Amino acid sequence: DHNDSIRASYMTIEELHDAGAALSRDGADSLPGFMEFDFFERHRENEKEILRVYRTTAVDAENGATITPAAEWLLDNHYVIEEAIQEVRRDFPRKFYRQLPTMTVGGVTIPRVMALGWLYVAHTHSTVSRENMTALVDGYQTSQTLQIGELWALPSIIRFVLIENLRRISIRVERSRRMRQKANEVVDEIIRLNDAEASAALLKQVDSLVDDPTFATQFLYRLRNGSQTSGFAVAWLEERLHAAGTDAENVMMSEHNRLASGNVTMGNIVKSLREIDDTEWSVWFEEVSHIDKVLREETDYEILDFGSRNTYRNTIELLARRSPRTEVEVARAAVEMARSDLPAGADENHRVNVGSVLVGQRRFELEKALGYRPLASQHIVRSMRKFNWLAIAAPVLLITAVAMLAVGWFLAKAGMPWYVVTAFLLMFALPASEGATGLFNTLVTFFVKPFRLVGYEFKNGIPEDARTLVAVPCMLTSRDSVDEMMRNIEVHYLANPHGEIYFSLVSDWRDAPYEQSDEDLEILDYAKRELAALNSRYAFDGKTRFYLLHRRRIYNSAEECWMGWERKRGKLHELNMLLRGDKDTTFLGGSNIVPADVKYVMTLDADTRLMRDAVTKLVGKMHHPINRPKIDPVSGRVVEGYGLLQPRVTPSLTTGKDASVFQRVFSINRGIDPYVFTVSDVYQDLTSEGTFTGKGLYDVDAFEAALKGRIEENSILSHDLLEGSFARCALVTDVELVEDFPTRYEVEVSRQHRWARGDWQLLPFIIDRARGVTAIGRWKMVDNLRRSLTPIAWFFASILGWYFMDPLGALIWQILLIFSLFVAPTLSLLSGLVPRSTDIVPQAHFFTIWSEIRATNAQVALRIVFIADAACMMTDAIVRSLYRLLVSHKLMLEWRTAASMQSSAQGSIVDYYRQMWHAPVVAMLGLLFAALPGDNAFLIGIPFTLLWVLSPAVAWYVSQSAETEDRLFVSEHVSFELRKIARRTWRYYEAFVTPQENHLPPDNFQETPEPIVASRTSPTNIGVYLLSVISARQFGWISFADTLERIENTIQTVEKMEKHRGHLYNWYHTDTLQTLGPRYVSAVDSGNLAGHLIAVSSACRDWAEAPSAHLQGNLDGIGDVAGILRETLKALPDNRKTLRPLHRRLEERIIGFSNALASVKREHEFASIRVINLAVLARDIQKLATNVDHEVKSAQSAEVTRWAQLLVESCEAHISDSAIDLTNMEPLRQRLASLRDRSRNLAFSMDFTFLYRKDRRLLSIGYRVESKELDEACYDLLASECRLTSLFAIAKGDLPTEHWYRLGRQVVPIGAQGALVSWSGSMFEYLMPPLVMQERQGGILNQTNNLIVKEQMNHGRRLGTPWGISEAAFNARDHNMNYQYTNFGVPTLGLKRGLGQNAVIAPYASILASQYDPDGALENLDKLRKLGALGQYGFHDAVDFTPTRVPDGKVCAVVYNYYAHHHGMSIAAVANVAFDGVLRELFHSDPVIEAAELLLQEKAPREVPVMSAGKEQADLLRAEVRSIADPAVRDREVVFLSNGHYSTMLTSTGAGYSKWNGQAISRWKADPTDDRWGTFIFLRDTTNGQWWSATAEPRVIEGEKTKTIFTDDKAEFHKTIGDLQSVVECIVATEHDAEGRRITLLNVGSEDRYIEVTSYMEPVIASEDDDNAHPLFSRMFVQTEIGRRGDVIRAWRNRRSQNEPGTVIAHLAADNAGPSRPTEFETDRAKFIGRGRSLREAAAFDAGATLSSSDGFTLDPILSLRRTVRVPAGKKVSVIFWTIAAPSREEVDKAIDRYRHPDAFAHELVHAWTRTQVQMRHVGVTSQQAAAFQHLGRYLTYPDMHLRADSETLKTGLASQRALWPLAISGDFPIFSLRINDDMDMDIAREALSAHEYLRSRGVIFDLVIVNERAASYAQDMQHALDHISETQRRINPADGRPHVFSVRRDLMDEETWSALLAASRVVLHVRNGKIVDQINRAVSLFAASDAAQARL
């Protein structure tokens, strides 16, 4: 075991420890491998070599080759080997790798961490285990410890060493394969020529190829053990090998090495890579770390936000790096100085707050004490901090001043009396200010690290001393909105259920002029009842979590309505005193209860949603003592502390089912990105305060002090800025809170001008030094005012610019004006393409810049076209605000009642123009005023003014709704056809559901071959059936009572259905309700059933709350059934005796009924009396259909009758729905409530904990109750259907988020973008989550779905056949045919080799994809409908296209199967498409699933990785067709035909025999030089007198341009001579032991040819040995005789005793294509031969003496018939010859009445094809393997010998007597002598025994001998291993003695027996030197090469 890998005598545990300990003091000085190199270049070369050795192996093994076990892992798992090649180079930038210390291993210097990698890949078998590395690092750290980072590099450096060994093994295994087969052709050339002179010249060249210790292994084997061998070929190999004295067998054994070791190490490499990928390294690093041992005691490092712990570690490492001190004492000396920091807290009485000096206030003192010298970046940052807010405002002002100076220098050329330049500069500097602040933000993001806040870890929830009440300010315009407000509260509670957390709602009954209208009591009482009901459901631990607080309002001092003390700040404050033991708060009596302390309060809002367990982060961060506010006693402002923490906010992807183009263009930041850790902001990294926009967390005491100290009455909501400025703020940027953006262009300007009004209202605080305001806060309000003033400045600047100046160069100024707006957003865009000073070389990553370029361009265009409207509206707002600022009005608390806009209707162009009416008028008036002066401003002004005036038009265009996944525009015809298809498909459920322990789908159901139902049930079937029932009720196909009955029956059945811990077993019985096989539980079935039951229960609740409006329905099914009837009626042929009156009458009646239905649907009130009369019309249609049927008994007439029936009970169901009492719905409410309860109970019943593998996460494939063991693998990909099950399992609570965040995510480049990688990428694995869940436009899943559907459509175009590939039952039938089942997909998204040879189309695929693309799917469905794919109950299962399984000349194949599994999905998809996805909300209407819905969404990352990559039509599987032109001048070939007990053999020229059950039918002998024995068909020319044969072998006519086909089923013979050709195909029939010889003759001449046909067969019935012993007897007992209707001759042996079998045989003439002619017989061979003649020169084929018709007890009987044919020019003649036999005479008559009739040949060819397909499927054979086995049988059945042993070894052996002693008599046995000695392959013997079993089915009898040839050490183990597989055949066959299989152990038996066996063996083979089914083909290419001239003689 050498190879070239790195192995160093594996030593196991307790030796690695000592090795590392020795290495610590004095080690290395050598390595098992090692070589001088450099990192990056070596890694790149490794990449190149791995790609090559991979691409070469892929281009090989497809042309036909044997793949080594070592190459199996590389081919199968190249993808995993790739990303491990990645994830390094990424984790080692050049500078980072440089710092690693030196080790100096013998001269050269090596990184210390990577040197340990070489020591531990070697003392293993390339296996990595956690405990091994732990022991090694423990042993190594005895003297010198491993610092932080180095211990972070072992996982990223081991993979570098591992792939190096992979390269060293792959480069050798690839070389060892091609050069192995190099000897194959050389020895072929050696054996081709029998020379002894040129052989030396040939062998001299390969002198350099003899020292390689694998060339000789195959060369010597193929020579010595091959066959012919040589005395000089193996004469130099030994002599040359004598160098180094390795003798002969040492090299033999050396090839045994370097192979098994290679395979083992190659497998171990992949196993180790998988283990490293799956294992966690943070926990292992924490365990084995040394610096963390000190930091576990005396400090709280354990529970401190692991990311923040890493921040501590980074700070410690940075301090240690730049200071002249080691790393250990940095974390130790800090503790000593922090020991004097004093406890300073309640919980903190013990322990030491080390973070107070590391990240806290005392960082500078720590740095000064430790001697650390700050970095220049830290120096400039601290200078910035010591400056203050001015360091931020100064650069922007400087840039604006520079821009102003530049523009003033440029714009000084048109006079400017200097009283207008000031105005222009003031109005232009604001875009300059925006550009300057954008540039400053970009640069600070580039150069300043973001800010992170340290917090606690509340793993068990928020504990005592921190109580949070989630006060969600809310409103109350209720009646039904209170229900969704409670839903929001419930979802928020479900978001963070852990910990001592309370929830409540704070609201206010609007603003009314009255203090209390007293009518709110009913709404208040209803709200209290809802709260009480919500309290009971979650009554756990006796915790009244949900409260309700409502304010009573007080009248405003100035005016308006009762609005409290303040609209919001008010509620917040009077809540603040409420929690502080205050009782005079005027909220309300009764509902004024609070849970005691509640130190913290969530602000939140009525719409924003919360991340799961997000509050556990903010609460811990604020409870951290460093973040606790201090409050300044002199003036409360919190000098050092964080009273307010604000979380970062990102908008939602789509506002429910509405996404307009306006949404996409004015919101760039969308989606949730898992990778981003922290975002950088200009404010927090430069001032350490953030912005408390609308949400956050505050301390009650600090907030109360800061607000009540300075706040005053009469302030607008702008309190948020003031409240944040009071104490402090801090953007945590680690907690997310989603929100939405309005889609209609009415509210955006509303909120914008309200905030502008608030900002302007903040001006008095800016202008006043008194009160309380910060200079930085003053600057931020000034910036807000500047942002408000930008559009007015721009607009008025333009207005004055085109007027005052009016030059010819005025275009440049507007160019710069729009250039500023282009510049403003684009700087942040460039922040993605910056490489940060060429960090690493990038991979393929796409560019996709067009999307954001278009977005920016459209956004700027919309901004410049709406700027006038925005400016006008918010200037009105500014004037209104300034009125209150100056005059001090009483209107400054207005929220929304402004009458300026007062929008009260939907958008319309007729509405915006009237409501705005201001900005376009102002613009046009300004243009008219400024156009006439100067006479040069019109050209510049016209296009721009036309842009502004058309503002309402583009606003209306962008306000319109757009389709994403549920509002798709489908029109009517597409929807009509989809509903029609669904209704037609639904007939299956009616047909196959009736109570017989039923209400379970019956799974598959065949149609053609005696249709049967397989009573097996799966949970997925139940779920899809329930969804189908819901969809059917939605469509109105069924009444309201029938749905209840079906649901109740299904629920009862599933309750009585046995369960294992709530889960359901894999398979069930419909009739007996018992488990079918082994008890197996799969995660897919339980997840699917739970997901569907959720929707069922939600819908039950939906129509149980108000069971009156859901009664009617839609009244659309009765139109779909009418359309079905119309379509069916068109296909009825109408050319009969009575023409077509009834068809016409039905046509007018149907169109009249359709018109009446349309008229009723047009009515709005939906009269019940109108639909009653339609039942009469339906009954009339039924009677007319019955009248049509009574005269024509066609199947389609029955279909018409059935589809009329379905219509008339559809009408009955609608009437019954209209016939409900509708007066007592309370019992119905009870029924629906009970159904909902029993449905949702089963939803939560299953427990998914036991399927969770807590070593590598993810859900296992399944569970087996036996042995209580998990299967093995897990669903390791996002593209799996289990993502619904995972979502439910994580939402239920028994799973963490690491489950969801550790599976899939891979991308494959297709087109411009990328999609999701799949295993067996059929969209069966994609479509289910869209069916049940909700998908948004911006999500990854929808984009991937679009890409995959486009790719499948393109694949369908390129292949030619219709598209759509998914798993189904492909065209292959087993014993008791069931059509089988397997998976399919597309090659691009497969990851599985062999998916390109299927070519299978599934009809249900097209309807599945109809959701995303309706038109293409509809066209594909129509294309399928053109073919035969529509059955009785809908579309069939699949259609086949692979040419191997394609029968006859048909283009395609049809599978007649219906699956209950693939039918409900179609109905669900149709319901989703037609009714705008009702099922989308049904699943998502449950609080439990709605709480975890936010794990969805996310954006497509933006950088696709791209891994390594008529061929589509050239890769389909193809069978083998043996095409032979002229067999006469070639060697013979044999084809076998057998039905299992009737076998016949056919040679290359029509010779052969027929064996029945082991006896003979026609005499046959093995004459190699004659081959003229068997049945022959003779053709004679009447006019010329010449006679010949159809095969022409016994005659041979000059010319003879023949052809031959010997494919399966039929053997085809071709022969043409003299413008006359004869083609004959011979096939054996089925069910009657009949062999058919159909002679087919065609003529293309110009004259009538008069020729005759003659038959010749010899009936012999014996035991194949008695006949060959004394033929006279067996000839004599034959009793050939012909009876009436002289076309059949029956011959049976006369009976001697009671032991003879009998087996009467007969021959059939069965004339065809002839009016009337008589046949003649010559049943006597004595007159046929002629006493001295032969077959080639016969006597009967002579003028005269023509078939004297001798019959009886003839001495030498045969069977022969003659039939003259009349074949004119251009027409056809056909005659069939039948060879039949039967054990009894009475059975012959039962078969003669089936072939004597005309035709009788078609419909048996298909039977033979089906039977041979079944036989070849029963045993794992292949067409090429079948051909090889038939060639082997040809060699075995004839005394031809071409692959036997040598001509020298066999001489001194073969006594033939020493065979019975070894139990192998070998009397009636040609014997085969496969020899094996490897024990490694164990596959050649399996193929040999499979061939023998195959040969046993074709009437070939021989015994298989496997000669074990291993030494006695492993001989017993090898014998047991081979018996493990042979014992399936060593058992006796069905009553014969012993079976034909043998095995001998070489050591025990004597040498003489082995020599005799090898000499007498017909074929000798070795397992190494060749392969089964491949050595047979090599003989034909080697044994080849004057017997041609005498042919045509």
Residue numbers in the entry: 20 to 1528, 1536 to 1962, 1964 to 2012, 2020 to 2027
Lines quoted from the article behind this entry:
Cyclic β-1,2-glucan (CβG) is a circular polysaccharide critical for host interactions of many bacteria, including major pathogens of humans (Brucella) and plants (Agrobacterium). The production of the main CβG chain occurs in the cytoplasm and is orchestrated by the cyclic glucan synthase (Cgs), a large, multi-domain membrane protein that contains several enzymatic sites. We determine the structure of this complex protein machinery and clarify key aspects of CβG synthesis, revealing a distinct mechanism that uses a tyrosine-linked oligosaccharide intermediate in cycles of polymerization and processing of the glucan chain.
In order to determine the structure of Cgs, we constructed a strain of A. tumefaciens C58 carrying an insertion in the chromosomal copy of the chvB gene encoding a C-terminal 3xFlag-tag (CgsWT). The CgsWT and CgsiGP samples produced high resolution maps of the full-length protein. The CgsWT map contains a disordered density docked at the active site of CY, which could potentially correspond to a glucan chain reaction intermediate. The CgsWT and CgsiGP3 maps obtained in the presence of UDP-Glc contain additional densities of glucan chain fragments bound to the protein at the cytoplasmic side of the CTD. This surface, which stretches between the CY and GP enzymatic pockets, appears to contain affinity sites capable of coordinating the polysaccharide. The first site, at the CY active site (CgsWT map), contains a disordered density. We found that an additional mass corresponding to 9- and 3-glucose chains is attached to the IF1-homology loop in CgsWT, while no such modifications were detected in CgsiGT.
